[PDB]
Amino acid sequence: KMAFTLADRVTEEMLADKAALVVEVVEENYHDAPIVGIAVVNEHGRFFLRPETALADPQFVAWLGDETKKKSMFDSKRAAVALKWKGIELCGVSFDLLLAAYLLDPAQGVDDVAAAAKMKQYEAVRPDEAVYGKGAKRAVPDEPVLAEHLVRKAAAIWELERPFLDELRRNEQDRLLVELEQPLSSILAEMEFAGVKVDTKRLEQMGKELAEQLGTVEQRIYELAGQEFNINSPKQLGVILFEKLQLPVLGYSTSADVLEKLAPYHEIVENILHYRQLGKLQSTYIEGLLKVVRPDTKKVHTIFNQALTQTGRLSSTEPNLQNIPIRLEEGRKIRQAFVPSESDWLIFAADYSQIELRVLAHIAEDDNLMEAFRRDLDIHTKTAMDIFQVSEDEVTPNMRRQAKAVNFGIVYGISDYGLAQNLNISRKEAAEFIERYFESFPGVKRYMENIVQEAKQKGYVTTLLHRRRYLPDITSRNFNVRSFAERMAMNTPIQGSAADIIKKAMIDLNARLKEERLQAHLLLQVHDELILEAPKEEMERLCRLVPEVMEQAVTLRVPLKVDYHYGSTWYDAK
DNA sequence: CCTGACTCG
DNA sequence: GCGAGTCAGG
Ligand SMILES: OC[C@H]1O[C@@](CO)(O[C@H]2O[C@H](CO)[C@@H](O)[C@H](O)[C@H]2O)[C@@H](O)[C@@H]1O
Numbered sequence: 001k002m003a004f005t006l007a008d009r010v011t012e013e014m015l016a017d018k019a020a021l022v023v024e025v026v027e028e029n030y031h032d033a034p035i036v037g038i039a040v041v042n043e044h045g046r047f048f049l050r051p052e053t054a055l056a057d058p059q060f061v062a063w064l065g066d067e068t069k070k071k072s073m074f075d076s077k078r079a080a081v082a083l084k085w086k087g088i089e090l091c092g093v094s095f096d097l098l099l100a101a102y103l104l105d106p107a108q109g110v111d112d113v114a115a116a117a118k119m120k121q122y123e124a125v126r127p128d129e130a131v132y133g134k135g136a137k138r139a140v141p142d143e144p145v146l147a148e149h150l151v152r153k154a155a156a157i158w159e160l161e162r163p164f165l166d167e168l169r170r171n172e173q174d175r176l177l178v179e180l181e182q183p184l185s186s187i188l189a190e191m192e193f194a195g196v197k198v199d200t201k202r203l204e205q206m207g208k209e210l211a212e213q214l215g216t217v218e219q220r221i222y223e224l225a226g227q228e229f230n231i232n233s234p235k236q237l238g239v240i241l242f243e244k245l246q247l248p249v250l251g252y253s254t255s256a257d258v259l260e261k262l263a264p265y266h267e268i269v270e271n272i273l274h275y276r277q278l279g280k281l282q283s284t285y286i287e288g289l290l291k292v293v294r295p296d297t298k299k300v301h302t303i304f305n306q307a308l309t310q311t312g313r314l315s316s317t318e319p320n321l322q323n324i325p326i327r328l329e330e331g332r333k334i335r336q337a338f339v340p341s342e343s344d345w346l347i348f349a350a351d352y353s354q355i356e357l358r359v360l361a362h363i364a365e366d367d368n369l370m371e372a373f374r375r376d377l378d379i380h381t382k383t384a385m386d387i388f389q390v391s392e393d394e395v396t397p398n399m400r401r402q403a404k405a406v407n408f409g410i411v412y413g414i415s416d417y418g419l420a421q422n423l424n425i426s427r428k429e430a431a432e433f434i435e436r437y438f439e440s441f442p443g444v445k446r447y448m449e450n451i452v453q454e455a456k457q458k459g460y461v462t463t464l465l466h467r468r469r470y471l472p473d474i475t476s477r478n479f480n481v482r483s484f485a486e487r488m489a490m491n492t493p494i495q496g497s498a499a500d501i502i503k504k505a506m507i508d509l510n511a512r513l514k515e516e517r518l519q520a521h522l523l524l525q526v527h528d529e530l531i532l533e534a535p536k537e538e539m540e541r542l543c544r545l546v547p548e549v550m551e552q553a554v555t556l557r558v559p560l561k562v563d564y565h566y567g568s569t570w571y572d573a574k
Numbered sequence: 575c576c577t578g579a580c581t582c583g
Numbered sequence: 584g585c586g587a588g589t590c591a592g593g
């Protein structure tokens with residue numbers, strides 16, 4: 001066993017200006033959740049404190065908020081938010097092991113202290129899952145077992161800080177941790193805690209009108225099929241489409257891509273696609289959303305997973321506010337349900353225009369692509385002009401659409417198969433497009449070749465701010481497995497650098513909002529855009545400040561461009 | 575608990 | 584084709 005003092009009261013030696021701190025929140029969703037225990041490890045020793053006793057002690061609380069008292073933790077955002085819900089401010093977190101491990105190797109999927117420690121051959125700590133269990137069996141163990149687990153985690157963090165910081169320094173990722181990710185952690189904490197206001201009453205009205213339409217398309221489907229069946233059963237649907245109605249096969253696959261091609265054969269296909277759209281808005285964006293709105297404040301408090309994506313992007317859960325409908329008008333209406341939290345306040349949204357491609361232009365130093373952006377040209381029309389060799393005047397809607405698709409392919413790691421599949425054309429033709437694209441953008445071609453070669457030589461690829469991704473399959477003798485890694489080598493520096501940029505913009509924006517003492521604050525981040533809320537009196541100032549700060553986040557060989565809109569609801573901010 | 579469907583940048 | 588999360592079904 002590990003030695004530790006199971007304290008009954010807080011003592012001075014527990015308030016050293018340097019310590020590994022553990023403020024345990026077992027619940028997955030930490031919003032307004034319980035803190036089941038506390039552990040502190042420092043010069044003087046290892047201690048376990050009960051929350052009701054420590055969070056009531058004015059000295060402990062002052063220590064938690066004393067920024068000069070440095071704390072090392074694992075997932076400090078979790079503790080900070082749980083503490084915000086109790087009116088307690090956590091300050092001075094100088095090292096976060098979860099974020100440190102995430103920068104060192106995102107593929108490891110480090111989600112507990114045990115996994116992080118395993119990276120440095122340290123195993124004197126148990127995986128949280130072995131302690132709390134999971135699912136319907138998850139539970140907080142008795143004090144003895146709980147206290148030892150928390151102390152062991154604190155002791156691990158205490159021991160591992162140095163080794164993790166040393167490696168970060170070698171990787172040139174020390175500043176990435178201390179100046180980007182950790183400060184961002186605190187900003188993400190304020191955003192989650194603030195939450196976003198939902199107009200539940202109008203959301204239930206939409207759910208009512210939706211319920212009526214689904215009933216219509218539903219019965220219309222049973223008619224065209226001359227039989228009732230579970231439309232949501234990919235298995236039952238396959239029977240009705242490929243057996244009863246003899247539709248062509250191009251069990252059974254009824255993916256959206258398949259049905260779009262079957263549409264011309266039978267009227268039922270169109271209806272099944274619409275029914276699926278509406279059915280998705282109903283189950284997820286109506287019923288599912290309402291399930292997570294706080295009844296008392298009518299707010300939803302998302303949780304941004306800051307150490308999950310392989311590219312450095314953020315992810316969002318319970319609910320996922322990074323995938324709210326907008327493409328099809330019927331689903332876009334859902335956004336009229338996200339409103340400001342105060343009367344006379346408005347929603348302000350600012351987004352980078354073509355940041356991936358601008359980053360690509362920068363990194364590849366392609367003359368044509370850099371010139372195009374310097375002229376702030378419509379990138380897809382320009383790409384169409386170059387690959388089809390025609391004047392702007394001769395670009396047809398269909399040419400542009402296809403040049404647009406090629407730009408995606410180039411960004412996601414261009415491949416004969418991938419483009420051909422996306423445009424519903426032959427590979428020989430796709431290779432034809434790609435071929436032409438590289439003729440017009442030789443710089444982009446050189447980069448794709450060089451980055452793949454660099455991935456093979458170094459073993460990984462990096463982003464603008466030194467985030468990295470290891471690509472061991474880049475040397476596989478299996479074509480498919482190797483090709484996956486190659487695309488990643490091409491795409492990660494693009495998607496990854498775009499992530500670094502917007503993360504820094506969030507940090508710069510917040511320092512500016514505070515300098516100006518503006519009431520405006522961040523609500524969400526959707527990969528290449530920032531959503532804020534502020535009194536209407538601050539709109540004119542934000543119109544100049546937000547774009548400015550986002551455009552000046554970093555300096556590239558091409559300018560960064562930001563569009564913005566504001567309105568009464570998220571929907572109107574367009 | 576795992577597909578196969580949908581949603582987003 | 585790159586990166587994500589949620590839900591009804593089986
Ligand atoms: O607190 C977020 C942080 O925790 C991890 C690991 O514990 O994920 C946990 O919390 C998420 C938000 O509720 C869940 O989606 C996830 O299933 C749960 O393990 C990290 O991945 C994350 O950075």
Ligand SMILES: OC[C@H]1O[C@@](CO)(O[C@H]2O[C@H](CO)[C@@H](O)[C@H](O)[C@H]2O)[C@@H](O)[C@@H]1O
Nearest residue numbers: 218222227228229230231232233279591
């Ligand atoms: O009780 C409803 C009953 O309807 C079936 C078809 O007869 O399913 C329809 O309605 C469901 C919603 O209640 C949808 O999920 C399903 O997609 C639609 O076909 C039966 O499965 C169900 O028992």
